Design a protein around this ligand. Structure first.
Ligand SMILES: Cc1cc2nc3c(=O)[nH]c(=O)nc-3n(C[C@H](O)[C@H](O)[C@H](O)COP(=O)(O)OP(=O)(O)OC[C@H]3O[C@@H](n4cnc5c(N)ncnc54)[C@H](O)[C@@H]3O)c2cc1C
Ligand SMILES: NC(=O)c1ccc[n+]([C@@H]2O[C@H](COP(=O)([O-])OP(=O)(O)OC[C@H]3O[C@@H](n4cnc5c(N)ncnc54)[C@H](OP(=O)(O)O)[C@@H]3O)[C@@H](O)[C@H]2O)c1
Ligand SMILES: Cc1cc2nc3c(=O)[nH]c(=O)nc-3n(C[C@H](O)[C@H](O)[C@H](O)COP(=O)(O)O)c2cc1C
Ligand SMILES: [Ca+2]
Length: 607
């Protein structure tokens, strides 16, 4: 059906929840809200806006008690997710009267970014401008705090508002219904079983372009080398062969990789569950009208699903804990789990401490709640899909057109729970032996780019792994110089803990400076003295030259830690401009923010 409104009429739904999602979180929130509808006598469905035409919103009044909800995540520079781009474009050009339309929006964002929840804010503002009626205030979910708690708090007030305005009431039947039913495929041909590939069956074996998120290219690991000294931490440089993939990229772009869960974790889950992981099965949607026939590719074995399709490392969200409680035979244990779904009080404190702060993954929860023995098929229905991880490409395609490089630090730490957590993708990449080893990947374009004019100077700030895109930038600027082009100054402000422990690309950067490609190599060693010495300290010391370059039209790039470094660096640039630019601090802020709008102050930061 082309019209979501007609689809709603045909299937008896009065609430439709659209999701703007890239890594599945918004989709899960939409699904959870859609299922809630029944608890109020209403009927809902979640939907991918890209599959429909949002202009049809003006027809919702044809359905009694119609309600439309939007769970939208914000991405690069405050833009919409790819699947919500058409909707965003429609909202920008339309002036249709949406009187009679009733809506609510929950935005997914992260305060460490420059444009916090920009998409949710825009959708909410626009719908009202068009004449639609807001049923409940805009939800501002913040992944830098705890997005789950923001969502459940908003969700509760949301339904109360729905009850008040539409005159409905809760049912109270927390029975919780399964969304999928299990079918064991005892006699299936081996060749018809998914073995970890995404999308089409056999797409990993039979690789045909175009390669993207739904059809990743299996790139061979040609290089995987340790960049630092000591068993302390592990920093590594990988080179992935993309020959014959037709994949294109530019320095500044991101490479996404689909990891495989640790087999030791998968094996232990199978044992504690008392399940034969090699059983091949299928989970089928009880809603025969939904386009989402299964929770992940199937038929497939439990081992395969728990290895390639499901997230078993991230601390579970509250709905998973609430639904599992019914399987805890011990009163105390079943009570602990049930409470964690509370938006406040003891229950919330326990969730944030026992699950989140303690970083307990599903196996840890099953282990620390020994009476919890849920059927493996229901667990597979509850666990979120395993998502790709993004890395800043550390190579220039002008120099390495057939290889995509990665600079990454392995995540590994002890939990207050006495366990050793290992980063999903980094522990997996670390184990990829060069020269056989394949990494399913794809490229995600970014707006982080070297200046159009080679003469334009660049100021690069990237401590730690934030140096990644800049290795590529320098390779390219060096290449331009080798092509006989006039290249402006190229400055790198890099930082590490100690010059003899975690100085990434020491030799390469030194050679680029000796070659003349890297005009300046400014490095801050943070722990080689009593007080911290960071990149911003070096920027402040270089205020005169930096102001000259900025005033001249230089481009600034900041990559790495978004939580504190990005903010501290930005604050230092404000000070440089306020001090030497002949203007007040507030004017300096406006000045730097304006550079961002002009593409002369770019960010590639993360957490
Ligand atoms: C646009 C973008 C670009 C990126 N570029 C790079 C890059 O170039 N290089 C790079 O190394 N990474 C980069 N990252 C981070 C990268 O995508 C992954 O998040 C990171 O490699 C960790 O993934 P993982 O699967 O190994 O860890 P996961 O299994 O996902 O675990 C990570 C989580 O573990 C927890 N954690 C980590 N250390 C501790 C600790 N000491 N105590 C308690 N909890 C802890 C945190 O909750 C953290 O969120 C980028 C991210 C984005 C969004
Ligand atoms: O990659 P990775 O995680 O492995 O990097 P990382 O080692 O955690 O950090 C990279 C560098 O950034 C420094 N740093 C920490 N907080 C900072 C801030 N607010 N502003 C500027 N620099 C900061 C670190 O110093 P410290 O770790 O000594 O704080 C370190 O020298
Ligand atoms: C490359 C990237 C860029 C992001 N940019 C922003 C941003 O500009 N503003 C913001 O508020 N949040 C930003 N976020 C955070 C997401 O909006 C948040 O993680 C959300 O939960 C993701 O939802 P999803 O899993 O449904 O895609 C960004 C995340 C990534 C991975
Ligand atoms: Ca210097």
């Amino acid at each position: 059906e082309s019209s979501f409104v007609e689809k709603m009429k045909k299937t008896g739904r009065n609430i439709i929840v659209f999701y703007g999602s890239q890594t599945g979180t918004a989709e899960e929130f939409a699904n959870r809200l859609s299922k809630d509808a029944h608890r109020y006598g209403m009927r809902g469905m979640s939907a991918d806006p890209e599959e429909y035409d949002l202009a049809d919103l003006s027809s919702l009044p044809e359905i009694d008690n119609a309600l439309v909800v939007f769970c939208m995540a914000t991405y690069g520079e405050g833009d919409p997710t790819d699947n919500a781009q058409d909707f965003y474009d429609w909202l920008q050009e339309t002036d249709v009267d949406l009187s009679g339309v009733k809506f609510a929006v929950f935005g997914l964002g992260n305060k460490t970014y420059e444009h916090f929840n920009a998409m949710g804010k825009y959708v909410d503002k626009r719908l009202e401008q068009l004449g639609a009626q807001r049923i409940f205030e805009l939800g501002l979910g913040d992944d830098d705090g705890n997005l789950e708690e923001d969502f459940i708090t908003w969700r509760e007030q949301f339904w109360l508002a729905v009850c008040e305005h539409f005159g409905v009431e809760a049912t109270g039947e927390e029975s919780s219904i399964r969304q999928y039913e299990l079918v064991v495929h005892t006699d299936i041909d081996a060749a018809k079983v998914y073995m970890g590939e995404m999308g089409r069956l056999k797409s990993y074996e039979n690789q045909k372009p175009p390669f993207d998120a739904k059809n990743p290219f299996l790139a061979a690991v040609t290089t995987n080398r340790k960049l630092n000294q000591g068993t302390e931490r592990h920093l590594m440089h990988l080179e992935l062969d993309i020959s014959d993939s037709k994949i294109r990229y530019e320095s500044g772009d991101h490479v996404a990789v689909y990891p495989a869960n640790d087999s030791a974790l998968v094996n232990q889950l199978g044992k504690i569950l008392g399940a034969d992981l090699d059983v091949v099965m299928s989970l089928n949607n009880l809603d025969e009208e939904s386009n989402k026939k299964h929770p992940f590719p199937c038929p497939t074995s439990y081992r395969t699903a728990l290895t390639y399709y499901l997230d078993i490392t991230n601390p579970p969200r509250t709905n998973v804990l609430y639904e599992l409680a019914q399987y805890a035979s011990e009163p105390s244990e079943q009570e602990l789990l049930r409470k964690m779904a509370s938006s406040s009080g003891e229950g919330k404190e326990l969730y944030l401490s026992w699950v989140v702060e303690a970083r307990r993954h599903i196996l840890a929860i099953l282990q620390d709640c020994p009476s919890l023995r849920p059927p493996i098929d229901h667990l597979c229905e509850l666990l979120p899909r395993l998502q790709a991880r993004y890395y800043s490409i550390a190579s220039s395609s002008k120099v390495h057109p057939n290889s995509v490089h990665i600079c990454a630090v392995v995540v590994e730490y002890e939990t207050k729970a006495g366990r050793i957590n290992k980063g999903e993708a980094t522990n997996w990449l670390r184990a990829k032996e060069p020269v056989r080893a394949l990494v399913p990947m794809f490229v995600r374009k970014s707006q982080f780019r070297l200046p159009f004019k080679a003469t334009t100077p660049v100021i690069m700030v990237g401590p730690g792994t934030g140096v990644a895109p800049f290795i590529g930038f320098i390779q390219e600027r060096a290449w331009l110089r080798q092509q006989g082009k006039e290249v402006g100054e190229t400055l790198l402000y890099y930082g590490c803990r100690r010059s003899d422990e975690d100085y990434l690309y020491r030799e390469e950067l030194a050679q680029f400076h000796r070659d003349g490609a890297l005009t300046q190599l400014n490095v801050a060693f943070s722990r080689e003295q009593s007080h911290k010495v960071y990149v911003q300290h070096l920027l402040k010391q270089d205020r005169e030259h930096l102001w000259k370059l900025i005033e001249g039209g230089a481009h600034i790039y900041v990559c790495g830690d978004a939580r504190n470094m990005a903010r501290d660096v930005q604050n230092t640039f404000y000070d440089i401009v306020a001090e030497l630019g002949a203007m007040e601090h507030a004017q300096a802020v406006d000045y730097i923010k304006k550079l961002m709008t002009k593409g002369r102050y770019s960010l590639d930061v993360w957490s």
